[PDB]
Design a protein around this ligand. Structure first.
Ligand SMILES: Nc1ncnc2c1ncn2[C@@H]1O[C@H](COP(=O)(O)OP(=O)(O)C(F)(F)P(=O)(O)O)[C@@H](O)[C@H]1O
Ligand SMILES: Nc1ncnc2c1ncn2[C@@H]1O[C@H](COP(=O)(O)OP(=O)(O)C(F)(F)P(=O)(O)O)[C@@H](O)[C@H]1O
Lengths: 220, 220
């Protein structure tokens, strides 16, 4: 095993998934699989799933549980980086999706090993979301206080300007945190019942949260 | 005038919006605006709007209303193809969106000249969706029964294989078409109000529908 990870990283907006996923990524050289990013990449390719997703999506609807799970499957089966495990972010989001994912990873014979849930109190989140900065290109995020860029409003690797989002606000966030707890509790619960769940304290500085995770992972 | 147009093309899936859109382009030399494609392009280009849209939905969410109109406004202001006019397809879809789209075009100085609704019966529609073949790379559509390709499952101009990506499923179709109606009836009613709506029987053969459209537009 060791130097392979098949896991699911969950947490509310503001917990740092975008900050940890990349650390995990480089360590295990695993594939960082984001659902929306997979959706878009597939629509670009002119694939049957991509086109089917495209038409049902750009028509005011959502893509089916199985179209998602069939795409994840396509990725495991073809993505080059999917051979040293993966890091699934933002999926599942309903029980049946967690259900069909397990039933298909089962098929593939490559089960999830961990479901890391990043924990942090809302009050801390709606306060920390106020000062986030994203390199629009890479999506590399920084925080003006907690993980500041080395140069005033500049991306560490490109020297390009960082930007803050209009939705990066207290009111808008409160609605999203509420929605998050209501829909993630059953999935968290699903992962507890199968024994792969692990809580991590996301209230700690980045490097401490990194270490906490690397430890709950059990590799090494 | 005469060979300039600013309009919306509304109608149920399987109605024929994609099949007629290029005529309108020939006739008027204007841009084809499909919000779905607009969004995905913004996202991929690394714009603040791309960034926000890909944050909202990529977290299983629904992209504003304002992000949409503002993204359309970007097309208009800065896209050359949009200096002749534009053939807006698949927007608006709600009334707020219609009110917001109107308000911006009002401020802009270029309000819609026409809203064309493609009408066809639900029984036919499900049939239109079912037999649909598609050339992925170019997006060109065919119907294995009402408008077949010259060579079996082959794109007329490229010879490249066609695909069946229209969610070929019994119930789901009739259920979705019901959704379109409940969603769309107010947009049409909103446009008869504004005095710019024109309905078109899209059940007739393609060229017969185009002549109906061109006459309805009243620019020829
Ligand atoms: N341990 C930490 N302590 C304090 N701030 C942190 C910590 N880790 C990350 N942050 C940050 O708080 C903000 C949110 O983190 P990040 O942007 O990386 O992930 P998330 O907020 O979880 C999200 F992308 F995934 P999204 O909005 O998509 O849910 C950023 O400003 C980031 O710099
Ligand atoms: N008037 C017509 N008579 C017969 N077949 C037609 C006619 N117009 C279009 N078709 C077709 O019916 C199907 C639907 O057409 P098309 O793919 O062009 O538009 P629409 O279904 O209206 C859509 F693409 F824009 P969308 O999926 O965006 O909602 C295709 O199979 C195409 O061949």
């Amino acid at each position: 095993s060791s130097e392979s990870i098949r896991m699911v990283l969950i947490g509310p907006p503001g917990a740092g998934k975008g900050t940890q996923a990349p650390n995990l990524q480089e360590r295990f050289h695993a594939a960082h699989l984001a659902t929306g990013d997979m959706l878009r990449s597939q629509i670009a390719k002119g694939t049957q799933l991509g086109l089917e997703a495209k038409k049902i999506m750009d028509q005011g609807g959502l893509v089916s549980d199985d179209i998602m799970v069939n795409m994840i499957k396509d990725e495991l089966t073809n993505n080059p980086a999917c051979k040293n495990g993966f890091i699934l972010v933002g999926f599942p989001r309903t029980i049946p999706q967690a259900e069909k994912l397990d039933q298909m990873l089962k098929e593939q014979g490559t089960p999830l090993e961990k479901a890391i849930e990043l924990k942090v109190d809302d009050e801390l989140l709606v306060a920390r979301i106020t000062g986030r900065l994203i390199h629009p290109a890479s999506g590399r995020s920084y925080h003006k206080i907690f993980n500041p860029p080395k140069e005033d409003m500049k991306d560490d690797v490109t020297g390009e300007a960082l930007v803050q989002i209009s939705d990066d606000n207290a009111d808008a966030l409160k609605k999203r945190l509420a929605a998050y707890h209501a829909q993630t509790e059953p999935i968290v619960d699903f992962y507890k019942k199968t024994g792969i769940w692990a809580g991590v304290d996301a209230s700690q500085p980045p490097a401490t949260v990194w270490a906490d995770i690397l430890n709950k992972l059990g590799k090494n």
